[model samples]
Target: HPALTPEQKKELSDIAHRIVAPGKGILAADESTGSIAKRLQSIGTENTEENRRFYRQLLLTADDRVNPCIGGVILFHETLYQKADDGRPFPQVIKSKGGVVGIKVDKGVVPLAGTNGETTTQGLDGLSERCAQYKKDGADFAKWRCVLKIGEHTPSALAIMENANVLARYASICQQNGIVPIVEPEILPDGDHDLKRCQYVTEKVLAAVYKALSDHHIYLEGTLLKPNMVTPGHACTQKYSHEEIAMATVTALRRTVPPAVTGVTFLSGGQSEEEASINLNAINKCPLLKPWALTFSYGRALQASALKAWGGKKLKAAQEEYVKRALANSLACQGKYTP
Candidate 1:
């Protein structure tokens, strides 16, 4: 494993640090056209390119209130090239409002045979060239999601090692091209597992991820971790308090995540907007010596309310909801948010 050059480390380190600056986090607006189609249909809007662009515009141009709250935005390939109402490219619009642009490089997940319905993300084909082009096109960072599901005898050892290795490869390539890579190993919450089980799986999975990163000589200083918080399975009959969830989440990170990493940007993991903010606030308040910045890299948690608000004629209403969530999560990252 060759070490990164001083210049390479510094460039990536700077981008990672800037993304998690105090009171700021990331906006994960990188849903694929196919993924966002369901969102459009939920609002009863046709999933046309124009409609998707319009919806993205609502979030990207919310106003100055989000400038301080949002540090970066993750863009899909489509939205990266899409234009705003005034014909401004989406990337340009994000930068003008004080946010760095990030791109999702993974092509989506593919099924892995001989496993209990498991899958791994697969976008490494020509990723280096795509990352270079994306960097030239104004993206400073990139995201690649590797999902691990919780099931009896699932997320097998092969799945864990393979996914970790793939993620490390993606991160190594992104760094070579001067782009920060967000290593997202999301443990899906679709099970009947309890809190301790979720925590156990998360710890094991992240331990493998970091070990793979090390094996590939991926610079931790230039990386961000997008992981699921420790929570019970969605269908589990057990109910846990925010404090309990936060404690488990932080404990897992402290045990596994290295301090050299720039930040921990949590995925919403199907939590509602309010629940996500509250859980994040509690995570920040957890009495632990957490070394990395703990903030959000949310999708649905940040957009659900806004989507419902923008039910065709409520542009201003959508903007207001976005602002409120941003401001709330901003304070939460600092352990200062109120209900």
Candidate 2:
């Protein structure tokens, strides 16, 4: 309820930093309305704002004890303002459980011109103002998701530069207003690209992203990254081993990402939950210091189970199931999970 003082800012950052500190990860519950609808449809649940809030509150009430393993929780706009029916706001529930709260700021993908169906993320309209409001409303961080697609002669240079610049601008504004920005430029695993092609594209996009961040003079230390790991698209005929994927993913990060970043929390990029967990464990189990926390910033992977767990229930009962799922994810992220 108070502005963090200089000393308090440092203290808070210190704790937050230790989270994604290294060998740690994040759980992303920040599904946009569309993604949530798809999840609801899987179980024949109706997609309403009230239903959305109910579902998310169930997930957020996860025991804060899992906070020890989770560095932060990303929220959708709806979830940020939802309550536990006990009248407590969800953000307070997360903070009380010791997890940092973040909000998704990007409006979603928009088409890019002159690129074979390429697109960039939007939502910059009055973003600076909205970020300040969200921060005041209990969010300590914000997310902007930019998407890149892989195709022959695709991801036009225009797509990469445009998306990168948007992300950089988003980060600068967030930091100026005191909200840490999680810059996520996700390369969709929608094509037949091989692991090498995936790495090449990821490297180029990230390089441009950081360059824009520097050009915009974003403070890198306060920023976290949510990126897709190097992997062939789901349709790619070649399957990769854990060792291979881990090596490729790490090598790409080392070559392109800067050390000033607070952490590198990876997006699951549509990998099955077990596959995602194995890939993450492989990344952590990979032989390298990985200057930032080699952790997760998972969405579908984190919510898939909880959504099933909630099936339908009174808010209180659902919250406990939410906590159990969170606990499973937390330990799983730490490489200590055993099925």
Off by over 4 Å in 2: 1-19, 22-24, 315-325
> Which pairs of residues have clashing backbones in candidate 2?
62-323
**CA lDDT of 257 in candidate 1?**
98
Task: Report the Cα lDDT for residue 65, model 2.
Answer: 65
Q: Local distance difference test, per candidate? A: 0.91, 0.78
The candidate 1 region of ten consecutive residues with least summed lDDT is 1-10
- Shift in Å, residue 281, candidate 2: 0.8
- Model 1 TM-score is 0.98
Q: Across residues 249-273, which tens digit of lDDT does each residue of candidate 2 receive?
A: 9899988899988778889787677
lDDT of 2 at 114: 68
Write model 1 residue lDDT over 223-299, tens digit each, in one string.
Answer: 99999999998889988999899999999999999999999999989789888898999999999899998988999
